[PDB]
Design a protein around this motif. Sequence first.
Motif, mmCIF file in Angstrom:
data_model
loop_
_atom_site.group_PDB
_atom_site.id
_atom_site.type_symbol
_atom_site.label_atom_id
_atom_site.label_comp_id
_atom_site.label_asym_id
_atom_site.label_seq_id
_atom_site.Cartn_x
_atom_site.Cartn_y
_atom_site.Cartn_z
ATOM 1 N N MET A 73 25.901 37.319 -1.202
ATOM 2 C CA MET A 73 24.703 38.127 -1.353
ATOM 3 C C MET A 73 24.836 39.042 -2.570
ATOM 4 O O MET A 73 23.866 39.251 -3.312
ATOM 5 C CB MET A 73 24.400 38.945 -0.098
ATOM 6 N N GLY A 74 26.044 39.569 -2.779
ATOM 7 C CA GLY A 74 26.287 40.489 -3.886
ATOM 8 C C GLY A 74 26.063 41.928 -3.468
ATOM 9 O O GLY A 74 25.206 42.202 -2.616
ATOM 10 N N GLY A 75 26.835 42.845 -4.059
ATOM 11 C CA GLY A 75 26.763 44.273 -3.728
ATOM 12 C C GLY A 75 25.369 44.823 -3.950
ATOM 13 O O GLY A 75 25.006 45.180 -5.081
ATOM 14 N N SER A 76 24.589 44.880 -2.866
ATOM 15 C CA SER A 76 23.153 45.161 -2.946
ATOM 16 C C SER A 76 22.553 45.750 -1.658
ATOM 17 O O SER A 76 22.474 46.980 -1.509
ATOM 18 C CB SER A 76 22.379 43.897 -3.388
ATOM 19 N N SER A 77 22.153 44.861 -0.738
ATOM 20 C CA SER A 77 21.385 45.218 0.470
ATOM 21 C C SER A 77 22.122 46.131 1.467
ATOM 22 O O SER A 77 21.646 46.308 2.631
ATOM 23 C CB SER A 77 20.862 43.957 1.194
ATOM 24 N N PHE A 78 23.260 46.711 1.026
ATOM 25 C CA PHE A 78 24.026 47.609 1.896
ATOM 26 C C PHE A 78 23.697 49.088 1.655
ATOM 27 O O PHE A 78 23.678 49.884 2.608
ATOM 28 C CB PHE A 78 25.537 47.349 1.825
ATOM 29 N N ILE A 79 23.438 49.459 0.398
ATOM 30 C CA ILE A 79 22.805 50.750 0.130
ATOM 31 C C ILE A 79 21.383 50.667 0.679
ATOM 32 O O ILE A 79 20.809 51.672 1.103
ATOM 33 C CB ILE A 79 22.755 51.089 -1.365
ATOM 34 N N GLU A 80 20.845 49.443 0.680
ATOM 35 C CA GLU A 80 19.531 49.108 1.246
ATOM 36 C C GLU A 80 19.501 49.126 2.791
ATOM 37 O O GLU A 80 18.414 49.029 3.395
ATOM 38 C CB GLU A 80 19.082 47.741 0.701
ATOM 39 N N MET A 81 20.682 49.246 3.424
ATOM 40 C CA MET A 81 20.749 49.427 4.880
ATOM 41 C C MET A 81 21.480 50.708 5.289
ATOM 42 O O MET A 81 22.715 50.802 5.166
ATOM 43 C CB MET A 81 21.333 48.195 5.578
ATOM 44 N N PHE A 82 20.678 51.670 5.788
ATOM 45 C CA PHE A 82 21.086 53.035 6.167
ATOM 46 C C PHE A 82 22.218 53.121 7.208
ATOM 47 O O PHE A 82 23.352 52.721 6.915
ATOM 48 C CB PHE A 82 19.833 53.816 6.609
ATOM 49 N N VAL A 83 21.920 53.652 8.403
ATOM 50 C CA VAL A 83 22.950 53.818 9.440
ATOM 51 C C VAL A 83 22.926 52.675 10.465
ATOM 52 O O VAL A 83 21.852 52.105 10.733
ATOM 53 C CB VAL A 83 22.868 55.208 10.162
ATOM 54 N N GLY A 84 24.110 52.341 11.018
ATOM 55 C CA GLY A 84 24.246 51.315 12.072
ATOM 56 C C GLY A 84 23.791 49.886 11.733
ATOM 57 O O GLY A 84 22.776 49.678 11.039
ATOM 58 N N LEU A 85 24.537 48.900 12.246
ATOM 59 C CA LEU A 85 24.233 47.467 12.067
ATOM 60 C C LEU A 85 24.219 47.096 10.585
ATOM 61 O O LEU A 85 23.157 46.849 10.016
ATOM 62 C CB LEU A 85 22.886 47.104 12.729
#
Length: 249
Positions: free
Chosen positions: A75-87
Amino acid sequence: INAEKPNVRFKDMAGNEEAKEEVVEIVDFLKYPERYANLGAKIPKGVLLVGPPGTGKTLLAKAVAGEAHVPFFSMGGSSFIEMFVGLGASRVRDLFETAKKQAPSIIFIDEIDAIGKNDEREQTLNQLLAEMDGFGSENAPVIVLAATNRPEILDPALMRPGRFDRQVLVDKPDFNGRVEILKVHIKGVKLANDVNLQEVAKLTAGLAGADLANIINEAALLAGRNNQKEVRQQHLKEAVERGIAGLEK
């Protein structure tokens, strides 16, 4: 989801032979993990293609998968800053197993940086530092790769042996190699008699290889308002000389 094995190849890329070489050594790895697991030695650990803005790092990335007929899950370093708290690390640690299955392969993170961000600090950053070392195993022939540009603004623990131990240095191409680039994009573009790439290679420098790539087709496009044929030097001359307006948003 089931991932890809791209159709990209060094000598099929955009004339960036010098990092390829390095990156080449990672191919031979995935290609023949056995020769190594017979001599004793190996490196199922990442590599940190690093350089300026646009040198097909994000390309070369792929160009080692497709080079080795091995997959490119990432996926590449991306959608994780795009996902806040939990899961958050449910596709992220179920990411490695895919490759651990379909192996040998390439996990290519994007712009590592991203990785990281009651608290208000880094945590995802504090993740792959396990897997890049130990997990369900450490015997599978898989390999991480992640681009950078400002290597500084990053945790130093990345470079701890058994993690991001190497760094490939892709960069702006010499006023002798851009000339090789232009000489790639030129295929197609019907040309003049006096189209001297070298000159449109000259202080037509400073820019990357996707910028030059652009110069060409552009210069071509100035044949629309001017219903012409042979693409002539002065076309390239209108290289928007060397657009500097950028950085303004």
